Design a protein around this nucleic acid. Structure first.
Ligand code: MG
Ligand code: MG
Lengths: 120, 186, 120, 133, 1040, 26, 49
RNA sequence: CCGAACG
């Protein structure tokens, strides 16, 4: 507990200093970097990853993989708290109706730009 | 059943140890009496062949026991000839284990080369498992010593008659089967 | 309120040992026991204080008297039964382990008088 | 689970007066529907007295647009420099952005889970009651 | 294998030097700018996904009352954190390499080249950077330099960091973990090529993003004067020694040494020597420390399973690198000991030989903890002063972990296939599968299961996983290996198998041969059960026997009814089964130290203080059962001498009753079976009952003595013959012993191991007679039986033997026969119940509250007193009125009354699956008033046959009182109106029921059955119209 | 004897502290 | 704001009250004209190719 | 090596 507090003082201060002492990456370091990446990706004949299509053939298999992964934390689980029970509820809902889970997920990716507090 | 109890002891020794050092030392203090020494060596082979593949434990402890007392060395060579006799009944995994162990010890002078006479190279004399184990041991020793190293060691006049069957000169049918087979090896 | 401490319990395990020894001699003296049975039973008492008294619970350093009496017993029993003499009761060479416990008692008399004077 | 009915906002505010800003699971206990995480979020996203719920200035809009090009998509960073809260900043920027261009795949579906119910204003107490309310 | 295959890698002829640099990107995640990250992500993904990924990182991180906004780092617990890390790191890889060395290392977009390979050798050799990998934030680079390239580099380095004094070498990082010759030397060209390539690659990175740090890096040069190339990659320390260089002695021998082949020349050109990092050993030791620092009060079995998972992770990850890591072998011995002694400390008995290897290492099947082991191996350690210099080889070794005999617990290595072998096997099985499909798919005889069982646990994806339930939806699972790595930033359990995943890898190890070889090395399941309280359960074979898990009564009863006031009280039960079951070995007589208290009323000696053991053994010989077993065996040997009462020259010997505290008088014995016999018969000299011979000299009259005294053997002393001979030989010789005959011959019984024997003076016609008697006694007694069943309940060892039919519905007529049948309901104590179906009377004995003024437990004391009051009735009853079958409702009373019915061992005790409403019997106004109105304990004779059975049958009035009891259980304020139809509709005061005529009686019983049926259907969502004969009768009487 | 090999104290390491000579030494 | 043994209700702001860069523009501008130049050169060269 | 109290 003392070390998480001490780390978080240090880390709060690092986050503050970034906003004061500004982006550490220089405007012409970032551009050399962005340009190297562009010329790489273009050398590789790369195509962007598109937004998960509506009639996406794999959309439900990927969601089921996701939910399997999220469930897996709960296959030994013996006592859950309200966020773990809430998680299992939402995993069950998304297994039960994959299509509305998928529509929620795509609405999140499309719109959601502010998110809840992360616990550390 | 006391031989069964010694196979108990020797197996249990091998399965209960880490390095070939420990296994060997514990075995030798079990008090293995002469005449029954082979009872260990076959077990030294058997479990090694049952292993899913090569743990170098077997060849290690064996090539440490061979120069420890050449009795076990001649026993390993003669049991190699007996294994040449019966390898027809061998599953390929235990086959590869036995062959790779014998070749690994071969490249390290832990057994005489004379035991290698047990290889004939006739197609009426070579069953499938025969030539398969042969290709295995050949690639193994050609790795363990090298291509030029094996090409030097095996061509020696002091090694000549011991490669009699494996390189037959009496029939060019044998010469062709040997050449094609060994080429298909590597 | 009836939980006694290490002073009371060390005193009474020491008194239990002296009872055992005194009783061994009283059995000899009533005639119920030989001199050989007395000697073997005294050497047994002195070699088995961790079995017969429980005194190590209240002063666990006297595990070294118990280890020493065990080593003394191994040595004496080995050198005793050499030949046809064999493997059972009958060895009554008790002065080595007796003197182990006498050293224990000389060194613990001051500690126990302190503890028991404090209790009193 | 669900948006805040105005009785809950006022119990949460009375509890913030009684209990302070670090007892969110003590405050979470008055409200049966809400958990400490949601009470904390409601306070910080809607009921902090230091939240300007007033109409948007236009010094503030040009600050918001400067920032949304400076720190793109960093609404938690942008938000204290504008002075609003990240959901206020976010939807205000969406409004201004549609003002330039002048169903939608970008709006809440009926029976979907709203992500931030703690940002929306309190559903007012109704003409009736319930033994829950 | 890629280091080996770079062309002329090992040539140091022209001064060419090979450098192996490894370093992490030093604050790589911390320093991801979210604006630059956003911009770069928009290059590879939809701008909406880029913006979601960017916003998801800009969040508030809260700990308790602390909180800040993340503006700068990356949140590593994000689920797609790995994708950002790997793409950002790819950008840093392009910074390190340049877009030409990167595009050569990667290969064309159309034909990319595999991990460490190139298309040509002109492409391979063009550039110093030969081999390259980044494992998320850690980089491994292998350069090969000309001496011209190396010289130019060292120049530029020193001209940039000029130090004339030669202070270059001082703060250099090369590991001391290897021997001193074999590590990287202190040459100036080599130390300086190391530092120069570090410095030149560290200059390649904008320090606003990352640097390399020399202290979290490692460079190794292979040069003229340095033969080995070193690295450490994942937990593995690797030292590669080529043949061309300083081998000089052709070396292919060790189990954990990898032989590196060239892909072209196929000659083994080098050996890789593997250890485990000092970070790997610290990781494992911390992981054991964490197991040992657990919930504090955990079962022995979860301590053992967590040890097992820690050990399997260690051994199945590192496999052969564990071999040549000797600090690991010592760590494993120390840490397996640690686990064991935490388990021991769980019994307040740290002693060996209480807990021999058998207790820990015997499978969970055989009641042991199932610990795997890597500690019982000699630890090879060579002469200290010289050993770090030259890799001398081991001359001495130390005993790792102690055994019990020349015992040996199988080492867990030998059951884990080496990684080198796994990869050779995999090359083979997957190459052949490639040719097999590449050949058969056009031939249309495509591959199928059992075309491949030459390979089934084989291949590094097992050739086991193509035949999988989900092989369609595991082709879409990409990035799962990173996924698994990155889950440490999301959950607070650390998966020991973060590196592998069965749905893709397969199982990759199998430790079943290990459990069978550990059974064989413990002396087989029989030699294991020699240490156990089995042979005290009298289960004839171990085979038909299974253990309770108890996981059937954890969730099946309750969700939140378990409390912390009852939590450890439940985690003590599985240690009680374990302790009771190993008590022959735990509570054994040859203990080093321990005061040896004899248990309260038994002949059990506890050596030391095992509290769980004493509580178990104290509720097994409850109810003076030691006394009872002695009584029953001496009684029944005298009855075998009422059985053979005239054949030999003997008298009536009846049940010799003596001081009860004699069975557990473990120093002196006396007064067993009556001696009295008419004439003179000719006794032997003191032999063991084992033989049969030697009938012999003088025979005195009415001096025919036998003494049967019990015992509880330990594992190390249960030899009944030696004990019985010694007991006889001892205190027939002694004066404290009252033996009327000079032939007071001794019979011993081992209550723990169920053995028997005898030694003394045989009075002819005995050894074939006493042998017979004992061989039938040790199977037949009620006392030995209630023992075996108390022990079986304590162990929860059950067979598929379970006893004769219960009171199930198929027997509702059998109680009406000529034998007096008894029921009992021990819930309502209070007052006890006796329901006799054949006569309609009731023995309503009401129990006063003074019998519970200060009694220890309500339920425990009440259940035993109920059996004792049944026994007091069976006593104060004549012999003609005693029962033969006694059906008990509540299953708890099967124990006590069977012991109380040892003096009348003829009465049958068995359970009942049927339920009856004797609860409803106390819902009657009379039972609800009078019993609480009574002041003192009194027996109330009663009658459920108020005036009925004078004409009505026994079964008929039973089928009446069935609906009576049911509608009183449920309806009771409804059954009142049936039994209170009119004020003038009267009753008798000397009987409970108001008696009517047959038509009104039947109408009221039809209403009473309707009350039960229409009240069961509405609670069961069940129609009353499709109810069958049995579908009604099974609910109306009791429970189905 | 202890000819420069191994543990100085066999107390806090978890073995009984016996150093057997290799019957496998050449 | 942690302690209240008495339980006194404190006004919402009597609690809150007692005990309470220019490079970003440079970077985002550089990155945005980098995006622009990259996009335009990509479209130009890929539509003439 | 090895066991008692307490929490
Ligand atoms: Mg305290
Ligand atoms: Mg307390």
């Amino acid at each position: 507990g003392r070390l998480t507090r001490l780390y978080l003082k240090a880390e709060q201060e690092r986050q503050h200093n970034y906003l004061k002492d500004g982006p550490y990456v220089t405007p012409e370091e970032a551009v050399a970097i962005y340009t190297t990446t562009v010329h790489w990706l273009e050398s590789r004949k790369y195509s962007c990853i598109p937004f998960p299509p509506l009639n996406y053939k794999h959309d439900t298999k990927l969601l089921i993989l996701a939910l399997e992964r999220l469930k897996e934390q709960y296959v030994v689980a013996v006592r859950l708290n309200s966020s773990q029970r809430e998680e299992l509820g939402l995993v069950e809902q998304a297994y039960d109706n994959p299509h509305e889970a998928l529509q929620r997920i795509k609405r999140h990716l499309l719109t959601q730009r502010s998110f809840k507090e992360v616990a550390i | 059943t006391n031989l069964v109890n010694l196979r108990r002891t020797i197996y249990l020794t091998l399965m209960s140890s880490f390095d070939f050092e420990e296994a060997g030392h514990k075995l030798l203090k079990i008090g293995i009496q002469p005449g029954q020494e082979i009872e260990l060596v076959t077990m030294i082979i058997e479990c090694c062949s049952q292993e899913r593949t090569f743990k170098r434990f077997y060849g290690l402890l064996a090539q440490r026991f061979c120069y420890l007392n050449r009795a076990y060395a001649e026993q390993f060579e003669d049991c190699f000839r007996k294994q040449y006799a019966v390898i027809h009944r061998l599953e390929t995994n235990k086959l590869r284990n036995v062959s790779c162990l014998f070749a690994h010890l071969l490249a390290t002078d832990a057994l005489p080369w004379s035991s290698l006479s047990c290889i004939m190279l006739t197609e009426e004399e070579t069953t499938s498992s025969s030539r398969i184990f042969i290709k295995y041991l050949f690639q193994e020793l050609s790795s363990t010593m090298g291509l030029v190293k094996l090409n030097q060691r095996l061509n020696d006049p002091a090694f000549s008659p011991w490669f009699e069957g494996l390189f037959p000169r009496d029939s060019l049918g044998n010469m062709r089967f040997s050449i094609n087979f060994f080429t298909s090896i590597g | 309120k009836s939980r006694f401490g290490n002073a009371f319990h060390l005193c009474r395990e020491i008194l239990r040992l002296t009872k055992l020894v005194v009783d061994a001699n009283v059995q000899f003296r009533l005639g119920n026991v030989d001199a050989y049975q007395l000697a073997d039973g005294l050497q047994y008492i002195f070699a088995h204080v961790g079995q017969l008294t429980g005194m190590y619970r209240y002063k666990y350093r006297l595990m070294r008297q118990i280890r020493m009496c065990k080593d003394l017993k191994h040595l004496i029993y080995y050198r005793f039964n050499t030949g046809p003499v064999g493997k059972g009761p009958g060895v009554g060479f008790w002065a080595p382990m007796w003197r182990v416990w006498l050293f224990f008692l000389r060194g613990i008399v001051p500690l126990l008088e302190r503890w028991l004077g404090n209790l009193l | 689970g669900g948006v805040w009915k105005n009785t809950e906002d006022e119990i949460l505010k009375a509890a913030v007066m009684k209990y302070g800003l670090n007892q969110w699971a003590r405050i979470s206990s008055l409200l049966v529907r809400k958990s400490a995480k949601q009470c904390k979020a409601r306070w910080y996203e809607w009921l902090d007295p230091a939240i300007k719920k007033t109409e948007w200035t236009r010094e503030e809009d040009e600050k918001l647009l400067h920032l949304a090009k400076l720190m793109p998509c960093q609404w938690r960073t942008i938000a204290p420099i504008v002075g609003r809260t990240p959901a206020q900043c976010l939807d205000r920027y969406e409004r201004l952005l549609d003002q330039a261009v002048a169903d939608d795949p970008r709006r809440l579906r009926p029976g979907e889970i709203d992500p931030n119910p703690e940002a929306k204003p309190a559903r007012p107490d109704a003409v009736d009651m319930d033994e829950d309310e | 294998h890629g280091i080996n295959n770079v062309t002329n890698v090992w040539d140091t002829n022209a001064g060419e030097c090979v450098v192996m640099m490894q370093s992490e990107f030093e604050k790589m995640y911390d320093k991801i700018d979210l604006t630059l990250m956003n911009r770069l992500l928009r290059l590879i993904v939809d701008h909406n996904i880029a913006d979601y990924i960017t916003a998801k990182n800009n969040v508030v991180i809260a700990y308790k009352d602390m909180s800040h906004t993340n503006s700068y780092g990356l949140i590593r617990g994000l689920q797609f954190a790995s994708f950002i890390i790997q793409y950002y790191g790819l950008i840093l890889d392009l910074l390190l390499l340049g877009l030409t060395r990167a595009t050569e290392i990667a290969g064309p977009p159309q034909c990319p080249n595999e991990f460490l390979t190139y298309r040509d050798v002109k492409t391979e050799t063009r550039h110093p950077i030969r081999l390259y990998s980044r494992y998320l934030n850690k980089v491994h680079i292998m350069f090969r330099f000309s001496a011209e390239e190396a010289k130019d580099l060292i120049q530029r380095y020193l001209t940039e960091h000029p130090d004339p004094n030669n202070e270059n070498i001082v703060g250099y990082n090369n590991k001391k973990c290897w021997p001193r010759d074999a590590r990287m030397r202190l040459m100036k060209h080599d130390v300086n090529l190391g530092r120069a390539v570090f410095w030149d690659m560290k200059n390649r990175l904008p320090r606003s993003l990352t640097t390399f740090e020399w202290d979290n890096s490692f460079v190794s040069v292979y040069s003229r004067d340095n033969p080995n190339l070193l690295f450490s990659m994942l937990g593995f320390e690797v030292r590669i020694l080529p043949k061309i260089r300083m081998a000089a002695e052709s070396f292919a021998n060790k189990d954990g040494v990898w032989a590196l082949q060239n892909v072209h020349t196929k000659e083994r050109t080098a050996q890789a020597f593997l250890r485990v990092d000092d970070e790997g050993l610290k990781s494992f030791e911390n992981r054991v420390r964490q197991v040992l620092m657990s919930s504090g009060s955990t079962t022995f079995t979860k301590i053992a399973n967590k040890w097992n998972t820690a050990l399997i992770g260690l051994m199945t990850y590192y496999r052969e690198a564990v071999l040549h890591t000797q600090e690991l072998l010592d760590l494993l011995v120390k840490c397996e000991n640690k686990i064991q002694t935490r388990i021991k400390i769980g019994l307040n008995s740290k002693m060996p030989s209480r807990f021999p290897p058998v207790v820990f290492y015997s499978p969970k099947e055989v009641g042991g903890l199932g610990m795997l082991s890597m500690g019982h191996i000699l630890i090879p350690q060579s002469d200290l002063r010289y050993s770090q210099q030259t890799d001398l080889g081991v001359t001495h070794f130390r005993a790792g972990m102690s055994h019990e005999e020349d015992q040996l617990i199988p080492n867990l290595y030998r059951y884990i296939q080496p990684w080198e072998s796994e990869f050779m096997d995999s090359e083979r099985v997957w190459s052949e599968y490639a040719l097999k499909k590449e050949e058969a798919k056009a031939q249309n005889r495509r591959l199928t299961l059992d075309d491949l069982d030459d390979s089934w646990d084989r291949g590094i994806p097992r050739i086991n996983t193509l035949f999988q339930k989900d092989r369609h939806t595991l082709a879409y699972d990409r990035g799962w290996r990173v996924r698994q790595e990155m889950k440490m930033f999301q959950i607070t359990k650390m998966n020991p198998f973060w590196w592998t995943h069965q749905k893709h890898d397969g199982k990759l190890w199998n430790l079943n041969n290990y459990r069978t070889d550990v059974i064989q090395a413990l002396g087989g399941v029989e030699g294991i059960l020699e240490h156990t309280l089995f042979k005290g359960t009298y289960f004839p074979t171990w085979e038909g026997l299974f253990w309770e898990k108890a996981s059937g009564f954890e969730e099946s009863m309750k969700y939140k009814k378990l409390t912390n006031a009852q939590r450890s009280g439940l985690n003590q039960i599985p240690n009680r089964r374990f302790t009771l079951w190993w008590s022959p070995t735990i509570n054994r007589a040859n203990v080093y130290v321990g005061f040896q208290v004899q248990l309260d009323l038994t002949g059990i000696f506890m050596h030391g203080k095992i509290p769980t053991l004493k509580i178990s053994l104290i509720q097994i010989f409850r109810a003076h059962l030691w006394q009872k077993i002695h009584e029953s065996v001496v009684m029944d040997l005298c009855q075998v001498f009422d059985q053979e009462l005239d054949a030999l020259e003997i008298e009536t010997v009846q049940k010799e009753t003596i001081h009860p505290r004699k069975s557990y008088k473990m120093n002196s014995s006396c007064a067993d079976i009556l001696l009295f016999a008419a004439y003179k018969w000719n006794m032997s000299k003191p032999s063991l009952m084992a033989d049969t011979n030697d009938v012999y000299d003088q025979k005195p009259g009415n001096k025919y003595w036998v003494d049967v005294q019990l015992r509880w053997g330990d594992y190390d002393s249960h030899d009944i013959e030696r004990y019985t001979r010694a007991k006889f030989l001892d205190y027939t010789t002694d004066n404290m012993s009252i033996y009327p005959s000079p032939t007071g011959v001794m019979i011993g019984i081992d209550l723990a191991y169920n053995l028997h024997s005898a030694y003394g003076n045989w009075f002819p016609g005995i050894k074939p007679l006493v042998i017979q008697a004992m061989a039938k006694i040790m199977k037949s007694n009620p006392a030995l039986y209630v023992l075996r069943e108390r022990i079986r309940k304590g162990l929860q060892l059950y067979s598929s033997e379970p006893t004769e039919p219960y009171l199930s519905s198929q027997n509702y007529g059998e109680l009406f026969s000529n034998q007096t049948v008894w029921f009992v309901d021990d819930t309502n104590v209070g007052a006890i119940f006796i329901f006799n179906p054949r006569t309609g009377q009731l023995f309503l004995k009401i129990i006063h509250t003074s019998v519970w003024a200060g009694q220890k437990r309500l339920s425990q004391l009440a259940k035993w007193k109920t059996a004792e009051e049944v026994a007091a009735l069976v006593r104060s009853l004549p012999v003609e009125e005693q029962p033969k079958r006694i059906i008990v409702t509540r299953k708890g009373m099967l124990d006590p009354l069977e012991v109380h019915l040892l003096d009348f061992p003829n009465i049958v005790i068995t359970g009942s699956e049927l339920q009856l409403p004797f609860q409803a019997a106390i819902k009657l106004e009379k039972f609800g008033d009078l019993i609480l109105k009574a002041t003192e304990p009194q027996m109330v004779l009663f009658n459920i046959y108020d005036d009925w059975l004078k004409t009505i049958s026994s079964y008929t009035a039973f089928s009446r009182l069935i609906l009576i009891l049911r509608a009183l259980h449920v309806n009771p304020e409804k059954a009142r109106m049936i039994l209170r139809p009119d004020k003038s509709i009267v009753t008798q005061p000397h009987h409970v029921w108001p008696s009517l005529t047959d038509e009104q009686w039947i109408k009221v019983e039809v209403a009473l059955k309707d009350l039960i049926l229409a009240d069961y259907g509405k609670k069961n969502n069940v129609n009353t119209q499709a109810l069958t004969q049995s579908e009604i009768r099974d609910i109306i009487l009791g429970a189905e | 004897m202890y000819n420069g090999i191994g543990l100085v104290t066999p107390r806090g390491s978890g073995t009984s502290g016996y150093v057997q000579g290799n019957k496998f030494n050449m | 704001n942690w302690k209240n043994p008495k339980g006194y209700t404190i006004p919402l702001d009597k609690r809150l009250a007692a005990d309470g860069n220019d490079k970003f523009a440079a970077l985002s501008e550089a990155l945005f004209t980098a995006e622009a130049k990259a996009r335009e050169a990509i479209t130009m060269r890929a539509s003439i190719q």
